[PDB]
Ligand binder design. Sequence first.
Ligand SMILES: COc1ccc(-c2c(-c3cc(C(C)C)c(O)cc3O)n[nH]c2NC(C)=O)cc1
Length: 208
Amino acid sequence: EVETFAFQAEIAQLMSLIINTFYSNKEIFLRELISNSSDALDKIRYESLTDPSKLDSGKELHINLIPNKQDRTLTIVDTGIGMTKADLINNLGTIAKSGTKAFMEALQAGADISMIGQFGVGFYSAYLVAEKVTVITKHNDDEQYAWESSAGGSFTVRTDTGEPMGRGTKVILHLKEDQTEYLEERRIKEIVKKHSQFIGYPITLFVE
Ligand SMILES: COc1ccc(-c2c(-c3cc(C(C)C)c(O)cc3O)n[nH]c2NC(C)=O)cc1
């Protein structure tokens, strides 16, 4: 059972801009994804302060970066709050329509693509480096779902058939052929140190 949805026109336009604009500083995608993971981790941490049972689906709050050269994928896993199916469909928990309008106006007022996170839509920067993105998520109040898109105006949602995640979100970046530097350990370490050095959860870079 796979459900196919059209992106709202504004989101499709954001994705097209990201895909088509000449912009060399692509490495910021990682900071954006890691920031989203941190925000999700903050949410479960806060909820757990008053209801510890919310951690029954996993006590550890962390971020894992998993390169796979054989599959040409970089995977960002977190044990944050997760998203419901409804939130996945509704632009992955983001205020994407309003954020996109603001980002577009800013780009006219001198901003650059690296500022995308100021507009709540940093997730879509994944398309700087990925031909396809799969987001697998589990929230305590819902089942495990997989969202996926190769852009082109549509996305799919299905009940996930992979390994259970307990709680959290996994973003799988199916990298463009010319973007394989983002699978290299030294490159990933450099980017995390540059842009994500103060994130308040352990970031573990897996090796191959
Ligand atoms: C800035 O907008 C958002 C929107 C939603 C989340 C979010 C994620 C989550 C979302 C993404 C993207 C696919 C959007 C990701 O890369 C990693 C994540 O852990 N899980 N749970 C939540 N929910 C709350 C309340 O954070 C984070 C930031």
